[PDB]
Structures are given as C-alpha cells and as structure tokens.
Amino acid sequence: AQQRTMSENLRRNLAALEAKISEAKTKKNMLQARAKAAKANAELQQTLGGLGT
Amino acid sequence: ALFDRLGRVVRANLNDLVSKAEDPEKVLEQAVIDMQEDLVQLRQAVARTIAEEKRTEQRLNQDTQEAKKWEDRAKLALTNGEENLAREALARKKSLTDTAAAYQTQL
Amino acid sequence: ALFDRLGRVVRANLNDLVSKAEDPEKVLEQAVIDMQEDLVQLRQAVARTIAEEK
Amino acid sequence: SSATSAFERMENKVLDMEATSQAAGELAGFGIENQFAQLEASSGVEDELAALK
Prior knowledge:
This is part of a larger assembly, with 4 copies of chain A.
Chain A: H1 2-48
C-alpha cells in the first residue's frame, strides 16, 4: 500500500523534471540564434562608424 | 600635466610620420579593398542569421503536423471505445500545440 | 614659502621645455583624434546602461 | 554548485548582449528611414512610368 503510493510520488516528481529539462533544450535552441544575431548586428554598427586612428 | 603634454607630443609626431608614409593613390586603392573583404565577411554573418528565420519556420511546421497525428489517432481511439487512450493522445498534442505557439512568438 | 617658490620655478622651466616640443599644427590634429577615440568609449558606456533599461 | 544556476547565468549574458547591441544603434543614430522613404518615393514615380506604357 505504501509502495504503490510511493511509486506515484516518485513517478510525478520525475515527470516534472523531464518536462523542465525539455524546457531547457527548447530555451537553448532559440537562445543561440539571438547570440548569433546580436554579434552580427554589432559588426554592422562598427563598419558604418569607427572614429579616430 | 607636464608629462601628459610630452606624451601627447610624442603621439602627434608619430602620427605625422605615418601621414608622410601614406602615398595618396596606393593607400586609397587599398582602403577600398579592405572594405570589400570586410563587407563579404559581414554578408556571410547576416546570411547565417537569416538562416535561423528559415529554421524557426521549419521547427514550427513539424510540431503542428505532429500535433495533428495525435488528434487523428485520438479520434480513432474513440471509435475503438477507450477514452483513457484518447486523453493520453490529446494531452500530448496540447504540449506540441504550446511549443508551436512559442516558435511563432520567436519567429 | 621657500619650497613653494622653488617647486613652482622648476615646473615653469619644464613648461617651456615641453612647449618647445609642442609644434602647434601637429599637436592640434592629434588632440582632435584623441577626442574621437574617447567619444567611442563613452557612446558604448551609455549603450551598456540603456541596455539595462530594456 | 548547481547545473541550473550556471545555465540561467549564461542566458542573462546573451540577453545583456542583445540589449547592448540595440542600444549601440540607438546612440549611433539611424538615417535608414529617410533613405527608405526615397526608395518608396522612387517606386511612386515608376508607377506613372508603368501607366504611360
């Protein structure tokens, strides 16, 4: 009776973790795209400008 | 600022030496050539960023139609007479539906 | 005021020596360059503060 | 000490870069809009040129 209740507790806590690690993979995939974009944007600002020697 | 005055002077004199070294024509052609190399490198950086627009479009297409395959099977589960199997399919579809939404937001 | 007088005399003679090394034309141009290199640093300092607004 | 704490530390750096990049453009000045309006205007001249033929 205790085992069957315990298994459900463990199973749900794990399911929450599995979902959140999945959120993190989704985060990472789009987050790199911004890093690429931000870097690229910076080069455009430099080439158009630049001052002194 | 007695030292600072001298330090500024040394820099000015060095700049004048570079200014003498600069030939008018040859530096001028080279200057255009530098811009040409820089521009091509930057165009490639922009192209690799415009790639992620296409990738976000691709990611979205997938999940939306995977969501349908859960829907198709769920309705077929109703015919066979199991509501439990149908909810298990539909809940999963909901998550794919949520994921696709997030992509549109990004996109 | 002895030390005070002497220290100001030493500075004055040094001021003449470094003012001999100031050629007015070239030093003037370099100062315009100095301002421009500084201006870039300042603009990017402001940019990193406006970033925290967003 | 944690995998998560390191991960969301990284995201913040990417967001700071994104925000900084836009801000650099804001301070640079944009002249693109006035230039674009000239292209749009050019198109309106070309509408008449199409219409005549």
